[PDB]
Amino acid sequence: PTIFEERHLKYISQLGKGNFGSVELCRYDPLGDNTGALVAVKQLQHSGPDQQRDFQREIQILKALHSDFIVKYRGVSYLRLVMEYLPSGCLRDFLQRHRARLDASRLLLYSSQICKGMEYLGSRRCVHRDLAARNILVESEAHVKIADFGLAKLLPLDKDYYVVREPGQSPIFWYAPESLSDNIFSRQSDVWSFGVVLYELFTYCDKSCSPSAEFLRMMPALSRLLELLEEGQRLPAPPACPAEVHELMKLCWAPSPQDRPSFSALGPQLDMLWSGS
Numbered sequence: 570p571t572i573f574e575e576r577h578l579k580y581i582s583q584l585g586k587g588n589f590g591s592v593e594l595c596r597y598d599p600l601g602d603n604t605g606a607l608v609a610v611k612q613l614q615h616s617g618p619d620q621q622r623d624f625q626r627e628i629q630i631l632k633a634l635h636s637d638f639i640v641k642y643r644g645v646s647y648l649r650l651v652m653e654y655l656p657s658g659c660l661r662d663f664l665q666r667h668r669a670r671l672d673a674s675r676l677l678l679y680s681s682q683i684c685k686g687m688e689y690l691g692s693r694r695c696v697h698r699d700l701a702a703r704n705i706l707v708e709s710e711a712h713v714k715i716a717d718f719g720l721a722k723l724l725p726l727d728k729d730y731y732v733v734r735e736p737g738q739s740p741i742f743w744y745a746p747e748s749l750s751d752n753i754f755s756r757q758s759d760v761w762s763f764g765v766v767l768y769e770l771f772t773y774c775d776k777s778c779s780p781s782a783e784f785l786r787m788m789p790a791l792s793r794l795l796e797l798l799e800e801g802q803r804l805p806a807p808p809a810c811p812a813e814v815h816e817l818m819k820l821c822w823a824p825s826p827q828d829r830p831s832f833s834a835l836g837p838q839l840d841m842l843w844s845g846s
């Protein structure tokens with residue numbers, strides 16, 4: 570349906586948790602005979618005013634998004650947000666687990682699919698604010714989708730960026746410098762993060778050459794990272810990374826947001842790369 574009744578939603582396990590929310594594996598089972606379809610259900614664990622307003626906005630945002638490369642809204646229950654369920658789980662773990670099967674073509678196919686999802690999102694004036702391979706889902710061997718719009722913001726019609734009051738709670742290594750220094754988030758800070766997803770993809774999310782493992786190697790942690798970045802230090806090309814892919818990462822990592830490519834510019838290049846590979 571679009572409206573699911575709580576009494577029919579049957580708990581199975583936890584898929585994730587963060588902020589003050591959780592996503593659960595449930596079966597929607599109105600017959601009560603275990604033949605119902607599976608769904609992923611988000612709820613809040615905080616009955617406070619601004620977190621509920623946030624959760625409500627999240628629901629409206631995901632409701633109004635329609636992409637093959639964005640996780641599907643199914644409905645709500647009255648409080649809870651119901652979505653399609655992707656058993657394969659997150660791309661980060663998938664990459665670590667299937668490393669030896671997936672060649673550069675596939676890595677490029679995923680890159681392209683994510684870019685496309687983000688181009689669309691940006692066309693809806695939506696900043697995701699937490700793009701990272703741990704937040705991307707595997708629909709199938711050759712199909713991924715973006716997930717967790719828990720921190721996503723809509724840009725007002727008159728402003729192409731958004732300032733946030735409180736500090737971030739996400740791993741610092743995916744943040745654009747202007748986010749680090751000023752809490753400024755834009756579609757162009759999404760592009761920065763996307764560059765770190767490309768890195769993640771072409772390292773297959775290996776922990777030993779992770780963004781974190783690499784910063785700590787390159788020597789308050791947040792301040793230090795900002796300095797590194799301002800001096801022009803950048804993550805080095807993943808092992809056996811095609812150079813053209815590394816170059817795209819470096820463009821995504823341009824100091825100033827206005828000098829980063831758009832998602833609509835990036836996509837054609839990834840497709841050309843995919844086809845040539």
Ligand SMILES: CC(C)CS(=O)(=O)N1CCC[C@H](NC(=O)Nc2cnc3[nH]ccc3n2)C1
Pocket residue numbers: 584585586587588590591592609640652653654655656658659703704705706716717719
């Ligand atoms: C709770 C939030 C902070 C994190 S989160 O959104 O729960 N999250 C993101 C994707 C990876 C994990 N998800 C996951 O393993 N499997 C899975 C399957 N189908 C789904 N449909 C909708 C979400 C979702 N997640 C945790």
